[model samples]
Structures are given as structure tokens and as C-alpha cells.
Target: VDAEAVVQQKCISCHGGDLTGASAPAIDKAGANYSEEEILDIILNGQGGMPGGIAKGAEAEAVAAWLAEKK
Candidate 1:
């Protein structure tokens, strides 16, 4: 599946439609700040205000890989 579309539909609710800050902190810098594995961990294990396991299996994989390039 397309991670961009998936993320926008799933995460944009808080992170903003452009991955900018809204209810949650801006994720625009995630790519430069963390690796794909790190992102995957956060996505699966949850972050400060973000819940965990929103995506799983290959869905999570694609999301992490795509998020890792946000920079």
C-alpha cells in the first residue's frame, strides 16, 4: 500500500495534513532525526503522545520506510 496516503489518512488527524505540527509535534524532521528502525519502533511501541501499533506487518514496514525519508 502507499504509505503516504495511509499516513495522511491515519496520522494527519493529529500530526497535521502535511506532517506538520498540530495536536501532535511536527514529524517533518523525523527522517533526519531517526532511522527507519527507530521510526518503526516508535510506530509500533508508541511515542510520547502518539499511540502504538497503528500499523502492523507490511503496512508498518512501508510506513516506517516512507517516514524515514520525511527529511
Candidate 2:
């Protein structure tokens, strides 16, 4: 599935549609500055306002790779 689709399905309820300038920040452009590892860290581990990831194993990796494609 597409990254946006994955986010919508898995994270939109908490992160919101498009991760569009959340109470956190805009995930699209923000991810541009993050290393793949960092992006995975935030998604897999979660950050402020974000819950620690439910995604694990391949599911986690796939979602993280998808989000890392942002920007």
C-alpha cells in the first residue's frame, strides 16, 4: 500500500490525515531532514504526543520505509 494510505489506516486517527501539521509538526517536509534511522526511530518508538509503535517486524519496517519516502 501507499505511504499515505498506510498512514491513514495506521496512524491518521492519532497523527491525523497527511500528518499535515499536527500538534507535533508537518511530517512530510520534516522527514526530509531526518535520516532513515531517525524516521524509523520516531515511528517505531514514538515521540511526544505519539504512542509507542504498535507496528513491529515487517509491518514496522514497511511503514517506516513508507514514511521515510515523505518529501
Candidate 3:
């Protein structure tokens, strides 16, 4: 799956269509809880309410990297 698809399937419910925080928390310049590396780790191995390990390896990283673009 692609980054946007992953975002829609796995994140949109909590994060919103714009990758802006919602039920979870806004992941952006002012609200993100972790750095890129930390976020990637979490994506690979879930933390708290988030799940771990995308069926596609690089796909998860790509999505996380796109999230890094959030403001």
C-alpha cells in the first residue's frame, strides 16, 4: 500500500483526512510527541494505542516520513 492509502486505512479515523490530529493527537510542529526516529520506531513496533508493523516494510517508513511533513 502507498503512504496515503496507509494513512487513510490506519490513521484517518484518529488523525483526520489531512494528517492533522484528532482523537489521538495532532502530529505536527507544535504537538508531535516524538521525533522522526521515534515515530518510525513506533510505526514498526506500536506504542500505547497505535499498532505495529505494516504489512509492507518501506511503506510504513514512507507514511511516517510523510507525517514528518505535518505542521
Candidate with best TM-score: 1
| Superposition error at 21 for model 3 (Å) | 2.4
Candidate 1 per-residue lDDT, tens place, 1-71, comes to 78887787777788899888799988777888999999889889988888998877678888889989889
- The alpha-carbon lDDT assigned to residue 36 of candidate 3 equals 58
Which candidate model has the greater TM-score, 1 or 2? 1
* lDDT tens digits by residue: candidate 3, 1-71: 47668878876777676656787655544225565566678778966776677424777777777766654
Candidate 3 ranges beyond 4 A from true positions: 28-33, 54-56
lDDT of 3 at 6: 82
Estimated TM-score for each candidate:
0.91, 0.70, 0.66
Shift in Å, residue 19, candidate 1: 0.5
Per-model lDDT: 0.85, 0.68, 0.66
Candidates 2 and 3 compared: the better one by lDDT is 2
Q: RMSD of each candidate?
A: 1.0, 2.2, 2.9
- The Cα error of candidate 1 at residue 22, in Å, is 0.5
Each candidate's number of clashing pairs is 0, 0, 0
Error of 3 at 22 (Å): 2.6
